[PDB]
Amino acid sequence: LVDGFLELERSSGKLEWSAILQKMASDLGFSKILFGLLPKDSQDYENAFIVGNYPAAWREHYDRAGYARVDPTVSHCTQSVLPIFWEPSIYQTRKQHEFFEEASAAGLVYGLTMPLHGARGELGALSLSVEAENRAEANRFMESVLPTLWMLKDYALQSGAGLAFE
Amino acid sequence: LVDGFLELERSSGKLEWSAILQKMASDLGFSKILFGLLPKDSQDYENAFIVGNYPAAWREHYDRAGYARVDPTVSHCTQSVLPIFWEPSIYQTRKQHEFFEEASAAGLVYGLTMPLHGARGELGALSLSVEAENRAEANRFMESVLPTLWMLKDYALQSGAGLAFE
Ligand SMILES: O=C(Oc1c(Br)cc(Br)cc1CNC(=O)c1ccccc1[N+](=O)[O-])c1ccccc1
Ligand SMILES: O=C(Oc1c(Br)cc(Br)cc1CNC(=O)c1ccccc1[N+](=O)[O-])c1ccccc1
Protein backbone atom coordinates (compact mmCIF):
# COMPACT_ATOMS: atom_id res chain seq x y z
CA LEU A 1 0.00 0.00 0.00
CA VAL A 2 2.72 2.47 1.05
CA ASP A 3 4.68 1.58 -2.17
CA GLY A 4 1.43 2.36 -4.03
CA PHE A 5 1.28 5.75 -2.35
CA LEU A 6 4.94 6.32 -3.34
CA GLU A 7 4.11 5.40 -6.91
CA LEU A 8 1.19 7.83 -6.84
CA GLU A 9 3.53 10.53 -5.54
CA ARG A 10 6.11 9.84 -8.32
CA SER A 11 3.49 9.78 -11.09
CA SER A 12 3.59 12.38 -13.84
CA GLY A 13 0.12 13.35 -14.81
CA LYS A 14 -3.55 12.70 -14.16
CA LEU A 15 -3.58 9.71 -16.56
CA GLU A 16 -0.70 7.95 -14.79
CA TRP A 17 -2.11 8.65 -11.34
CA SER A 18 -5.50 7.25 -12.38
CA ALA A 19 -3.82 4.07 -13.78
CA ILE A 20 -1.91 3.47 -10.50
CA LEU A 21 -5.03 4.00 -8.33
CA GLN A 22 -7.17 1.70 -10.52
CA LYS A 23 -4.50 -1.01 -10.33
CA MET A 24 -4.29 -0.70 -6.55
CA ALA A 25 -8.10 -1.09 -6.38
CA SER A 26 -8.10 -3.93 -8.80
CA ASP A 27 -5.24 -5.71 -6.84
CA LEU A 28 -7.37 -5.41 -3.72
CA GLY A 29 -10.20 -7.19 -5.61
CA PHE A 30 -12.47 -4.28 -6.72
CA SER A 31 -13.42 -3.81 -10.37
CA LYS A 32 -14.48 -0.20 -10.97
CA ILE A 33 -13.62 2.97 -9.13
CA LEU A 34 -14.40 6.64 -9.12
CA PHE A 35 -12.31 9.14 -7.15
CA GLY A 36 -13.97 12.54 -7.06
CA LEU A 37 -12.70 15.71 -5.42
CA LEU A 38 -13.87 19.31 -5.14
CA PRO A 39 -11.91 22.30 -3.79
CA LYS A 40 -12.99 23.98 -0.53
CA ASP A 41 -16.42 25.73 -0.52
CA SER A 42 -17.34 24.41 -3.93
CA GLN A 43 -20.48 22.30 -4.45
CA ASP A 44 -19.94 22.86 -8.18
CA TYR A 45 -20.26 19.04 -8.65
CA GLU A 46 -19.51 19.18 -12.48
CA ASN A 47 -16.11 21.05 -12.05
CA ALA A 48 -14.49 18.43 -9.85
CA PHE A 49 -11.35 16.41 -10.28
CA ILE A 50 -12.74 13.03 -11.29
CA VAL A 51 -10.64 9.96 -12.02
CA GLY A 52 -11.29 6.26 -12.59
CA ASN A 53 -12.95 3.78 -14.83
CA TYR A 54 -16.69 3.90 -14.51
CA PRO A 55 -18.45 3.57 -17.95
CA ALA A 56 -18.00 6.89 -19.77
CA ALA A 57 -21.66 6.96 -20.78
CA TRP A 58 -22.66 6.46 -17.08
CA ARG A 59 -20.54 9.40 -15.96
CA GLU A 60 -22.11 11.58 -18.72
CA HIS A 61 -25.61 10.51 -17.73
CA TYR A 62 -24.92 11.22 -14.04
CA ASP A 63 -23.97 14.83 -14.87
CA ARG A 64 -26.94 15.37 -17.31
CA ALA A 65 -29.46 13.96 -14.86
CA GLY A 66 -28.17 16.02 -11.90
CA TYR A 67 -27.62 12.80 -9.95
CA ALA A 68 -25.15 14.55 -7.62
CA ARG A 69 -28.25 15.99 -6.01
CA VAL A 70 -29.93 12.54 -5.68
CA ASP A 71 -27.14 10.04 -5.03
CA PRO A 72 -27.44 9.16 -1.34
CA THR A 73 -23.64 8.65 -1.12
CA VAL A 74 -23.12 12.33 -1.92
CA SER A 75 -25.25 13.74 0.90
CA HIS A 76 -23.69 11.08 3.17
CA CYS A 77 -20.17 12.41 2.24
CA THR A 78 -21.20 15.97 3.19
CA GLN A 79 -22.18 14.65 6.72
CA SER A 80 -19.69 11.83 7.59
CA VAL A 81 -16.18 10.45 7.37
CA LEU A 82 -17.42 6.90 7.60
CA PRO A 83 -17.99 4.60 4.62
CA ILE A 84 -21.48 4.05 3.22
CA PHE A 85 -22.16 0.64 1.73
CA TRP A 86 -24.40 0.42 -1.35
CA GLU A 87 -27.26 -1.29 0.46
CA PRO A 88 -30.89 -1.24 -0.73
CA SER A 89 -31.78 0.76 2.39
CA ILE A 90 -29.82 3.88 1.23
CA TYR A 91 -32.19 4.40 -1.76
CA GLN A 92 -35.34 5.97 -0.31
CA THR A 93 -36.71 8.61 -2.67
CA ARG A 94 -38.23 7.85 -6.06
CA LYS A 95 -35.30 9.58 -7.72
CA GLN A 96 -32.89 7.49 -5.58
CA HIS A 97 -34.72 4.39 -6.87
CA GLU A 98 -34.30 5.44 -10.46
CA PHE A 99 -30.61 6.14 -9.66
CA PHE A 100 -30.13 2.62 -8.24
CA GLU A 101 -31.75 1.16 -11.35
CA GLU A 102 -29.66 3.09 -13.83
CA ALA A 103 -26.38 2.50 -11.88
CA SER A 104 -27.28 -1.16 -11.76
CA ALA A 105 -27.83 -1.27 -15.57
CA ALA A 106 -24.37 0.29 -15.72
CA GLY A 107 -23.00 -2.75 -13.89
CA LEU A 108 -22.57 -0.76 -10.58
CA VAL A 109 -24.64 -2.68 -7.98
CA TYR A 110 -22.48 -3.83 -5.05
CA GLY A 111 -19.83 -1.63 -3.50
CA LEU A 112 -19.12 1.23 -1.13
CA THR A 113 -18.32 4.89 -1.05
CA MET A 114 -15.55 6.29 1.24
CA PRO A 115 -16.00 10.01 1.95
CA LEU A 116 -12.91 12.21 1.58
CA HIS A 117 -12.32 15.28 3.66
CA GLY A 118 -8.92 16.89 3.04
CA ALA A 119 -6.80 19.01 5.31
CA ARG A 120 -7.53 22.11 3.15
CA GLY A 121 -11.29 21.56 3.07
CA GLU A 122 -11.36 19.46 -0.14
CA LEU A 123 -14.54 17.41 -0.33
CA GLY A 124 -14.79 14.11 -2.18
CA ALA A 125 -15.45 10.48 -2.48
CA LEU A 126 -13.78 7.29 -3.42
CA SER A 127 -16.38 4.78 -4.71
CA LEU A 128 -15.47 1.19 -5.49
CA SER A 129 -17.68 -1.45 -7.04
CA VAL A 130 -17.33 -5.20 -6.53
CA GLU A 131 -18.30 -8.05 -8.85
CA ALA A 132 -20.13 -10.72 -6.89
CA GLU A 133 -22.69 -13.46 -7.23
CA ASN A 134 -24.83 -11.90 -4.48
CA ARG A 135 -24.86 -9.05 -1.92
CA ALA A 136 -23.83 -11.45 0.80
CA GLU A 137 -20.66 -12.51 -1.08
CA ALA A 138 -19.98 -8.83 -1.92
CA ASN A 139 -20.36 -7.75 1.78
CA ARG A 140 -18.04 -10.49 2.99
CA PHE A 141 -15.43 -9.50 0.41
CA MET A 142 -15.65 -5.80 1.46
CA GLU A 143 -15.37 -6.63 5.18
CA SER A 144 -12.24 -8.67 4.53
CA VAL A 145 -10.45 -5.67 2.84
CA LEU A 146 -12.02 -2.74 4.70
CA PRO A 147 -8.96 -2.00 6.83
CA THR A 148 -6.68 -1.71 3.80
CA LEU A 149 -9.30 0.37 1.98
CA TRP A 150 -9.70 2.72 4.90
CA MET A 151 -5.96 3.49 4.73
CA LEU A 152 -6.01 3.64 0.91
CA LYS A 153 -8.68 6.34 0.81
CA ASP A 154 -6.57 8.68 2.91
CA TYR A 155 -3.37 8.01 0.88
CA ALA A 156 -5.48 8.63 -2.29
CA LEU A 157 -6.92 11.82 -0.82
CA GLN A 158 -3.55 13.20 0.24
CA SER A 159 -1.74 12.51 -3.11
CA GLY A 160 -4.85 13.35 -5.22
CA ALA A 161 -5.50 16.72 -3.63
CA GLY A 162 -1.95 17.84 -4.57
CA LEU A 163 -2.45 16.63 -8.09
CA ALA A 164 -5.90 18.12 -8.59
CA PHE A 165 -5.27 21.54 -7.01
CA GLU A 166 -1.73 22.79 -7.95
CA LEU B 1 -14.50 -1.54 16.60
CA VAL B 2 -17.99 -0.90 15.17
CA ASP B 3 -19.40 -2.10 18.57
CA GLY B 4 -17.05 0.37 20.19
CA PHE B 5 -18.38 3.07 17.92
CA LEU B 6 -21.96 2.04 18.76
CA GLU B 7 -21.04 2.31 22.49
CA LEU B 8 -19.56 5.79 21.89
CA GLU B 9 -22.78 6.70 20.06
CA ARG B 10 -25.05 5.32 22.87
CA SER B 11 -23.00 7.05 25.64
CA SER B 12 -24.17 10.10 27.56
CA GLY B 13 -21.74 12.83 28.38
CA LYS B 14 -18.09 13.60 27.90
CA LEU B 15 -17.13 11.37 30.85
CA GLU B 16 -18.61 8.12 29.52
CA TRP B 17 -17.46 8.78 25.95
CA SER B 18 -13.84 9.40 27.25
CA ALA B 19 -13.90 6.19 29.22
CA ILE B 20 -15.02 4.22 26.17
CA LEU B 21 -12.49 5.80 23.83
CA GLN B 22 -9.70 5.22 26.45
CA LYS B 23 -10.63 1.58 26.87
CA MET B 24 -10.67 1.04 23.09
CA ALA B 25 -7.14 2.53 22.88
CA SER B 26 -5.94 0.52 25.88
CA ASP B 27 -7.40 -2.67 24.48
CA LEU B 28 -5.49 -2.00 21.35
CA GLY B 29 -2.18 -1.61 23.34
CA PHE B 30 -1.88 2.16 23.82
CA SER B 31 -1.69 3.62 27.33
CA LYS B 32 -2.26 7.34 26.86
CA ILE B 33 -4.44 9.15 24.39
CA LEU B 34 -5.50 12.68 23.57
CA PHE B 35 -8.46 13.41 21.26
CA GLY B 36 -8.45 17.11 20.36
CA LEU B 37 -11.02 18.90 18.14
CA LEU B 38 -11.62 22.48 16.93
CA PRO B 39 -14.71 23.88 15.11
CA LYS B 40 -14.52 25.02 11.51
CA ASP B 41 -12.26 27.99 11.05
CA SER B 42 -10.94 28.14 14.62
CA GLN B 43 -7.19 28.18 15.17
CA ASP B 44 -7.98 28.48 18.97
CA TYR B 45 -5.88 25.48 20.17
CA GLU B 46 -6.24 26.32 23.91
CA ASN B 47 -10.11 26.27 23.64
CA ALA B 48 -10.07 22.97 21.74
CA PHE B 49 -12.51 20.25 22.82
CA ILE B 50 -10.15 17.80 24.48
CA VAL B 51 -10.66 14.26 25.68
CA GLY B 52 -8.34 11.67 27.22
CA ASN B 53 -5.93 10.64 29.92
CA TYR B 54 -2.73 12.65 29.29
CA PRO B 55 -1.39 13.85 32.67
CA ALA B 56 -3.25 17.03 33.67
CA ALA B 57 -0.15 18.97 34.51
CA TRP B 58 1.32 18.17 31.01
CA ARG B 59 -1.83 19.52 29.42
CA GLU B 60 -1.56 22.62 31.59
CA HIS B 61 2.09 23.08 30.70
CA TYR B 62 1.29 22.72 26.93
CA ASP B 63 -1.37 25.44 27.19
CA ARG B 64 0.80 27.79 29.29
CA ALA B 65 3.90 27.31 27.13
CA GLY B 66 1.91 27.78 23.90
CA TYR B 67 3.17 24.46 22.52
CA ALA B 68 0.35 24.37 19.93
CA ARG B 69 2.54 26.74 17.88
CA VAL B 70 5.63 24.49 18.44
CA ASP B 71 4.43 20.86 18.48
CA PRO B 72 5.30 19.59 14.96
CA THR B 73 2.26 17.29 14.88
CA VAL B 74 0.04 20.36 14.93
CA SER B 75 1.38 21.94 11.72
CA HIS B 76 1.26 18.44 10.19
CA CYS B 77 -2.42 18.01 11.05
CA THR B 78 -3.22 21.27 9.24
CA GLN B 79 -1.55 19.97 6.07
CA SER B 80 -2.25 16.22 5.93
CA VAL B 81 -4.71 13.36 6.64
CA LEU B 82 -1.83 10.85 7.07
CA PRO B 83 -0.45 9.85 10.49
CA ILE B 84 2.70 11.30 11.86
CA PHE B 85 4.82 9.09 14.05
CA TRP B 86 6.77 10.59 16.95
CA GLU B 87 10.22 10.08 15.38
CA PRO B 88 13.12 12.22 16.56
CA SER B 89 13.47 13.68 13.07
CA ILE B 90 10.09 15.54 13.40
CA TYR B 91 11.55 17.76 16.15
CA GLN B 92 13.67 20.29 14.16
CA THR B 93 13.63 23.73 15.83
CA ARG B 94 15.18 24.52 19.14
CA LYS B 95 11.73 24.99 20.71
CA GLN B 96 10.73 21.62 19.14
CA HIS B 97 13.63 19.94 20.94
CA GLU B 98 12.53 21.46 24.21
CA PHE B 99 8.97 20.20 23.48
CA PHE B 100 10.30 16.65 22.80
CA GLU B 101 12.22 16.65 26.09
CA GLU B 102 9.27 17.98 28.12
CA ALA B 103 6.74 15.62 26.54
CA SER B 104 9.15 12.79 27.19
CA ALA B 105 9.48 13.77 30.88
CA ALA B 106 5.68 13.35 30.99
CA GLY B 107 5.81 9.79 29.78
CA LEU B 108 4.84 10.79 26.22
CA VAL B 109 7.79 9.68 24.08
CA TYR B 110 6.66 6.91 21.79
CA GLY B 111 3.51 7.42 19.75
CA LEU B 112 1.69 8.79 16.78
CA THR B 113 -0.79 11.45 15.93
CA MET B 114 -3.70 10.77 13.49
CA PRO B 115 -4.99 14.07 11.88
CA LEU B 116 -8.73 14.56 12.09
CA HIS B 117 -10.63 16.41 9.38
CA GLY B 118 -14.37 16.27 9.81
CA ALA B 119 -17.20 16.64 7.30
CA ARG B 120 -18.19 20.08 8.69
CA GLY B 121 -14.61 21.39 8.65
CA GLU B 122 -13.64 20.30 12.18
CA LEU B 123 -9.89 20.11 12.75
CA GLY B 124 -8.30 17.78 15.22
CA ALA B 125 -5.83 15.17 16.32
CA LEU B 126 -5.98 11.75 17.90
CA SER B 127 -2.64 11.25 19.61
CA LEU B 128 -1.83 7.87 21.15
CA SER B 129 1.26 7.01 23.05
CA VAL B 130 2.68 3.58 23.64
CA GLU B 131 4.60 2.41 26.75
CA ALA B 132 7.34 0.27 25.27
CA GLU B 133 10.88 -0.37 26.45
CA ASN B 134 12.38 1.45 23.47
CA ARG B 135 11.44 3.14 20.19
CA ALA B 136 12.26 0.09 18.04
CA GLU B 137 9.75 -2.01 20.00
CA ALA B 138 7.12 0.86 19.94
CA ASN B 139 7.38 1.13 16.15
CA ARG B 140 6.93 -2.64 15.71
CA PHE B 141 3.92 -2.44 17.88
CA MET B 142 2.41 0.55 16.06
CA GLU B 143 2.97 -0.93 12.56
CA SER B 144 1.16 -4.13 13.70
CA VAL B 145 -2.01 -2.22 14.80
CA LEU B 146 -1.92 0.66 12.34
CA PRO B 147 -4.85 -0.45 10.13
CA THR B 148 -7.20 -0.79 13.17
CA LEU B 149 -6.03 2.56 14.45
CA TRP B 150 -6.58 4.23 11.06
CA MET B 151 -10.31 3.14 11.10
CA LEU B 152 -10.54 3.96 14.82
CA LYS B 153 -9.56 7.64 14.41
CA ASP B 154 -12.38 8.19 11.92
CA TYR B 155 -15.08 6.53 14.12
CA ALA B 156 -13.78 8.58 17.04
CA LEU B 157 -13.98 11.77 14.90
CA GLN B 158 -17.48 11.06 13.61
CA SER B 159 -18.81 10.30 17.15
CA GLY B 160 -16.78 12.92 18.96
CA ALA B 161 -17.57 15.78 16.60
CA GLY B 162 -21.23 15.18 17.51
CA LEU B 163 -20.33 15.19 21.24
CA ALA B 164 -18.26 18.40 20.88
CA PHE B 165 -20.39 20.71 18.64
CA GLU B 166 -23.96 19.47 17.91
O1 LIG C 1 -17.51 11.71 -7.11
C1 LIG C 1 -18.47 12.24 -6.64
O2 LIG C 1 -19.74 11.78 -7.05
C2 LIG C 1 -19.93 11.04 -8.18
C3 LIG C 1 -19.77 11.64 -9.42
BR1 LIG C 1 -19.40 13.45 -9.45
C4 LIG C 1 -20.03 11.00 -10.60
C5 LIG C 1 -20.36 9.67 -10.53
BR2 LIG C 1 -20.77 8.66 -12.06
C6 LIG C 1 -20.48 9.02 -9.31
C7 LIG C 1 -20.27 9.71 -8.10
C8 LIG C 1 -20.39 9.03 -6.74
N1 LIG C 1 -21.36 7.93 -6.67
C9 LIG C 1 -21.14 6.70 -6.95
O3 LIG C 1 -20.06 6.25 -7.35
C10 LIG C 1 -22.20 5.70 -6.74
C11 LIG C 1 -22.58 5.51 -5.43
C12 LIG C 1 -23.55 4.56 -5.11
C13 LIG C 1 -24.11 3.82 -6.11
C14 LIG C 1 -23.74 4.05 -7.45
C15 LIG C 1 -22.80 5.00 -7.75
N2 LIG C 1 -22.44 5.18 -9.09
O4 LIG C 1 -22.07 6.41 -9.57
O5 LIG C 1 -22.40 4.05 -9.87
C16 LIG C 1 -18.38 13.25 -5.59
C17 LIG C 1 -17.39 14.20 -5.58
C18 LIG C 1 -17.33 15.12 -4.56
C19 LIG C 1 -18.27 15.07 -3.54
C20 LIG C 1 -19.27 14.10 -3.56
C21 LIG C 1 -19.32 13.19 -4.61
O1 LIG D 1 -5.15 18.52 20.42
C1 LIG D 1 -4.42 19.08 19.67
O2 LIG D 1 -3.11 19.35 20.13
C2 LIG D 1 -2.71 19.05 21.40
C3 LIG D 1 -3.21 19.82 22.44
BR1 LIG D 1 -4.38 21.32 22.10
C4 LIG D 1 -2.74 19.61 23.72
C5 LIG D 1 -1.84 18.56 23.95
BR2 LIG D 1 -1.18 18.24 25.68
C6 LIG D 1 -1.34 17.81 22.92
C7 LIG D 1 -1.78 18.05 21.62
C8 LIG D 1 -1.29 17.20 20.46
N1 LIG D 1 0.09 16.73 20.55
C9 LIG D 1 0.49 15.63 21.08
O3 LIG D 1 -0.26 14.77 21.58
C10 LIG D 1 1.91 15.20 21.04
C11 LIG D 1 2.52 14.95 19.79
C12 LIG D 1 3.87 14.53 19.71
C13 LIG D 1 4.57 14.27 20.86
C14 LIG D 1 3.99 14.53 22.10
C15 LIG D 1 2.66 14.98 22.20
N2 LIG D 1 2.13 15.26 23.44
O4 LIG D 1 1.25 16.29 23.62
O5 LIG D 1 2.54 14.61 24.54
C16 LIG D 1 -4.83 19.48 18.31
C17 LIG D 1 -6.13 19.86 18.06
C18 LIG D 1 -6.43 20.24 16.76
C19 LIG D 1 -5.46 20.20 15.73
C20 LIG D 1 -4.15 19.80 16.02
C21 LIG D 1 -3.87 19.45 17.32
Swiss-Prot record, chains A, B:
What one GO molecular function would you report for this record? DNA-binding transcription factor activity
What do the Gene Ontology cellular component annotations say?
protein-DNA complex
Q: Does the keyword Ligase apply?
A: no
Biological processes per GO annotation:
positive regulation of DNA-templated transcription; quorum sensing; regulation of DNA-templated transcription; regulation of elastin catabolic process; regulation of gene expression
Task: Give UniProt keywords alphabetically.
Answer: Activator, DNA-binding, Quorum sensing, Transcription, Transcription regulation
Q: Where is the signal peptide?
A: none
Keyword check for Lipoprotein, yes or no: no
Domain of life per record:
Bacteria
Q: Which family does it belong to?
A: Belongs to the autoinducer-regulated transcriptional regulatory protein family.
Q: Other comments? A: LasR in strain PA103 is not active, this is probably due to the change in position 180 of the sequence.
Q: Give the function comment from the record.
A: Transcriptional activator of elastase structural gene (LasB). Binds to the PAI autoinducer.
Instruction: Give the protein name, as stated in the record.
Output: Transcriptional activator protein LasR
Lineage per the UniProt record:
Bacteria, Pseudomonadati, Pseudomonadota, Gammaproteobacteria, Pseudomonadales
Encoding gene (name): lasR
Q: Which residues of the full protein are shown?
A: 3 to 168 of 239
